[PDB]
Amino acid sequence: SSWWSHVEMGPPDPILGVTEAFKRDTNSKKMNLGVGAYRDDNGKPYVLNCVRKAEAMIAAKKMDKEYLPIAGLADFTRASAELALGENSEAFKSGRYVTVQGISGTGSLRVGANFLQRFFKFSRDVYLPKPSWGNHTPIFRDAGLQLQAYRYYDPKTCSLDFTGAMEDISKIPEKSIILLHACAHNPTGVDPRQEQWKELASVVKKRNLLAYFDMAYQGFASGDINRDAWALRHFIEQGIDVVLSQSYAHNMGLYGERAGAFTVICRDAEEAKRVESQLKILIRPMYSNPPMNGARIASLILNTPELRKEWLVEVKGMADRIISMRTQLVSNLKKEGSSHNWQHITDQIGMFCFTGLKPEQVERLTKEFSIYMTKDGRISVAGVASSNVGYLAHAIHQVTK
Amino acid sequence: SSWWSHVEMGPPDPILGVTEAFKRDTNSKKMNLGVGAYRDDNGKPYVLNCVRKAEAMIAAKKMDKEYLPIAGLADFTRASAELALGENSEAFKSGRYVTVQGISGTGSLRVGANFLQRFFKFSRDVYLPKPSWGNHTPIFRDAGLQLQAYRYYDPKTCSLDFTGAMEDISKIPEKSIILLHACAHNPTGVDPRQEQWKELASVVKKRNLLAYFDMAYQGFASGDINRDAWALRHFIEQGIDVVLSQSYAHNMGLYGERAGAFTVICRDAEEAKRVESQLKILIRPMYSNPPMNGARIASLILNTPELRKEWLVEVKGMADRIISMRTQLVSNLKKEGSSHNWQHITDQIGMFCFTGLKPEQVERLTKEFSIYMTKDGRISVAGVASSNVGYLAHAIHQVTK
Numbered sequence: 001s002s003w004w005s006h007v008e009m010g011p012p013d014p015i016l017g018v019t020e021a022f023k024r025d026t027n028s029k030k031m032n033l034g035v036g037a038y039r040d041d042n043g044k045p046y047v048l049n050c051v052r053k054a055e056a057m058i059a060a061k062k063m064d065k066e067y068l069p070i071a072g073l074a075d076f077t078r079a080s081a082e083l084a085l086g087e088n089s090e091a092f093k094s095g096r097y098v099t100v101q102g103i104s105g106t107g108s109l110r111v112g113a114n115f116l117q118r119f120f121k122f123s124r125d126v127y128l129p130k131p132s133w134g135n136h137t138p139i140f141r142d143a144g145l146q147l148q149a150y151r152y153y154d155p156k157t158c159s160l161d162f163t164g165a166m167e168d169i170s171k172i173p174e175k176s177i178i179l180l181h182a183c184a185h186n187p188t189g190v191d192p193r194q195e196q197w198k199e200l201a202s203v204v205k206k207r208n209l210l211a212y213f214d215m216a217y218q219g220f221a222s223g224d225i226n227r228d229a230w231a232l233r234h235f236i237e238q239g240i241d242v243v244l245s246q247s248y249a250h251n252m253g254l255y256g257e258r259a260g261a262f263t264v265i266c267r268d269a270e271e272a273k274r275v276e277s278q279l280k281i282l283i284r285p286m287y288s289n290p291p292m293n294g295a296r297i298a299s300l301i302l303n304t305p306e307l308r309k310e311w312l313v314e315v316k317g318m319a320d321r322i323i324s325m326r327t328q329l330v331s332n333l334k335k336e337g338s339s340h341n342w343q344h345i346t347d348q349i350g351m352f353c354f355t356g357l358k359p360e361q362v363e364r365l366t367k368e369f370s371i372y373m374t375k376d377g378r379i380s381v382a383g384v385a386s387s388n389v390g391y392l393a394h395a396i397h398q399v400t401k
Numbered sequence: 402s403s404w405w406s407h408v409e410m411g412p413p414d415p416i417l418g419v420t421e422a423f424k425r426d427t428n429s430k431k432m433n434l435g436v437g438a439y440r441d442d443n444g445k446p447y448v449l450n451c452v453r454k455a456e457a458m459i460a461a462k463k464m465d466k467e468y469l470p471i472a473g474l475a476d477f478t479r480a481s482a483e484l485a486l487g488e489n490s491e492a493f494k495s496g497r498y499v500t501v502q503g504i505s506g507t508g509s510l511r512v513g514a515n516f517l518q519r520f521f522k523f524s525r526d527v528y529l530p531k532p533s534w535g536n537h538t539p540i541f542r543d544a545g546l547q548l549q550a551y552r553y554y555d556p557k558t559c560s561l562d563f564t565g566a567m568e569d570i571s572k573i574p575e576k577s578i579i580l581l582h583a584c585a586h587n588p589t590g591v592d593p594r595q596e597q598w599k600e601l602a603s604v605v606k607k608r609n610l611l612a613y614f615d616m617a618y619q620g621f622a623s624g625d626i627n628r629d630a631w632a633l634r635h636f637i638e639q640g641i642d643v644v645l646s647q648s649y650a651h652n653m654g655l656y657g658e659r660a661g662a663f664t665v666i667c668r669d670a671e672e673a674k675r676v677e678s679q680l681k682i683l684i685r686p687m688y689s690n691p692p693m694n695g696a697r698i699a700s701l702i703l704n705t706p707e708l709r710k711e712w713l714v715e716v717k718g719m720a721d722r723i724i725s726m727r728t729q730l731v732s733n734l735k736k737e738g739s740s741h742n743w744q745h746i747t748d749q750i751g752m753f754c755f756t757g758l759k760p761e762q763v764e765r766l767t768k769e770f771s772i773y774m775t776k777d778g779r780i781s782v783a784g785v786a787s788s789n790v791g792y793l794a795h796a797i798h799q800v801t802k
């Protein structure tokens with residue numbers, strides 16, 4: 001019959017708009033600063049050498065394709081927890097955590113959202129920083145939670161509004177949920193420094209808030225897996241039992257294979273088995289059991305010393321290329337005669353950078369220079385290469401001079 | 402803390418318990434008839450030759466691991482639509498269908514369920530047959546719909562309660578949702594014959610019911626992909642715009658890779674685009690995009706003549722082993738001197754068989770013969786092999802005589 005006549009055409013994604021225009025452009029100097037995945041120095045997708053080798057191992061073993069347990073590959077969940085909490089972590093060693101494999105970071109955040117909706121009886125409010133990854137809204141919203149926000153980004157300085165953040169967080173009703181980015185805040189790239197993190201943890205402890213860490217870039221951010229997980233670990237050291245989402249999309253370049261994990265820090269191993277049974281019950285009617293390919297690759301790497309070692313070098317390489325590009329962009333802006341302060345470009349961390357450009361300026365950048373970005377002045381640093389950093393520098397100077 | 406103290410231990414999975422108790426048994430005669438996946442004649446997992454050939458082809462190309470679009474691999478979704486509807490299906494050729502890649506059968510069912518909750522304004526009720534796959538319930542329940550039922554299985558004769566089905570469907574409120582298993586009904590193995598399907602279509606047409614088909618065993622049930630898709634194709638052909646879920650778990654043996662799809666039959670190409678946009682809005686906050694490996698493997702086989710040709714041979718090979726084991730069970734039961742009527746075993750279709758055995762008899766089989774199965778009397782034919790079929794007939798005879 002005519003069941004669907006009332007379904008309206010959904011709104012178009014702006015990122016898709018930028019990508020389509022970029023593809024149409026004929027100018028060979030075109031840059032795509034809307035990319036959400038790492039690109040090497042030649043602007044190409046990069047499959048890690050350690051993933052090629054792990055894949056090669058799998059094939060040689062003639063593995064079956066049987067269904068994985070609901071919670072996922074045990075070797076993968078254990079390794080994920082170890083990676084995040086630290087091998088000599090008290091939480092890890094006493095077994096008071098529960099980790100289940102999720103569909104990358106997004107599926108892992110959703111399982112968590114769904115878990116909180118069902119069992120977190122104290123509140124339905126989730127406080128997100130201003131701004132946050134766009135998908136974070138519909139994720140918590142479709143799950144049944146209420147969205148709240150706390151000040152985070154300071155447009156005046158293109159850095160942390162520490163004063164605004166501490167004031168907001170201090171007024172959060174106790175036992176509410178606060179979403180924190182572990183590192184490489186998406187989309188601004190501004191992260192608290194260690195001393196700021198110490199103040200932040202004191203207050204969440206004091207106000208007895210449930211801390212939900214989104215850790216989508218461990219290793220990929222600064223090049224150091226322990227450094228990137230520092231604030232998460234500090235929070236747990238201070239006695240804050242968090243919930244966390246992990247993604248292997250960026251740090252292992254496993255994008256389409258969807259490898260990720262969801263973890264809950266419990267009081268003890270007893271309590272962990274209980275929440276693990278509830279997590280299994282929720283997941284079965286969602287998708288029954290997780291996709292095995294990304295987890296088998298991730299597991300092999302983390303668990304095989306030779307591989308793990310090669311992985312840390314390559315993840316460091318990715319991080320270093322991006323720091324390199326941020327470094328190069330501010331020196332070339334000085335070189336061009338920009339009198340403006342571009343240090344936020346080097347203070348920011350990870351793949352996304354909030355530049356401070358205004359909408360008028362990004363339009364000119366697109367129209368006249370064939371540099372494609374979203375109107376919020378957000379740039380994907382994976383889109384810059386050694387061959388075009390100078391150009392971008394030039395282009396930025398011209399629209400801000 | 403003490404966020405999770407009130408979270409209790411969830412109930413034990415009864416399938417888990419049979420498999421597990423099966424493991425703990427020492428008897429060299431032991432048999433696991435609770436297995437949910439195909440097993441060869443030696444009781445081993447079976448990865449198809451055609452899938453090993455596709456995996457080598459993917460390996461040779463050195464493909465990237467970039468994210469697939471939200472809706473999935475286009476070569477996969479089109480081929481999936483084509484296998485279900487038929488190449489010269491009117492619905493296929495006009496392009497009045499929308500096919501989205503889902504996480505195997507279960508995630509496909511669930512995005513479907515969530516789509517209905519959000520856009521099916523006509524009703525909140527879904528009518529499942531009595532009985533249906535266990536997971537069908539939480540799927541719809543967690544999605545937000547209300548469960549209802551229609552008589553299906555006749556315990557008295559271990560066949561279809563055709564009359565009861567027809568009376569129950571005739572009375573379903575107009576514009577209700579009805580779930581139909583396209584073939585090889587789970588868990589009984591009882592399917593309507595071609596003429597009863599015809600009669601069912603007309604009532605569904607008359608009551609103006611939204612028919613949701615669950616097609617998890619296309620090709621794997623009878624050895625023939627067209628015959629297995631007969632009922633679906635008939636409904637579309639009579640002008641019933643159906644909703645469908647497909648799984649490649651069993652027919653391609655892709656279990657853990659998670660390849661499946663969800664399709665909606667629309668009025669035209671224009672409406673298909675509107676519904677496709679909303680489905681994307683829905684999936685994004687669920688898991689962002691689907692896993693690429695299973696979809697890549699399945700797209701190659703379906704799209705490559707030589708591989709598709711091989712695949713058809715293997716799926717038939719699987720269906721025949723199953724039919725052979727059904728046939729041999731009945732003959733051995735007769736040979737044993739059993740006087741009960743066991744024709745239902747040969748009348749049933751697919752991997753699952755409702756034997757008619759009572760709880761205490763199942764218990765007798767477990768305790769004295771080392772035969773593991775659920776207390777509902779359902780056996781998974783995959784666990785029967787040429788070398789133990791004799792044994793199984795004998796035990797069943799001893800317990801029922």
Ligand SMILES: Cc1ncc(COP(=O)(O)O)c(C=O)c1O
Pocket residue numbers: 036103104105106107133186214216247248249255260688689
């Ligand atoms: C803040 C943030 N969270 C989570 C993710 C997870 O993406 P995926 O679903 O590929 O794991 C990303 C990157 O897309 C992200 O930037």
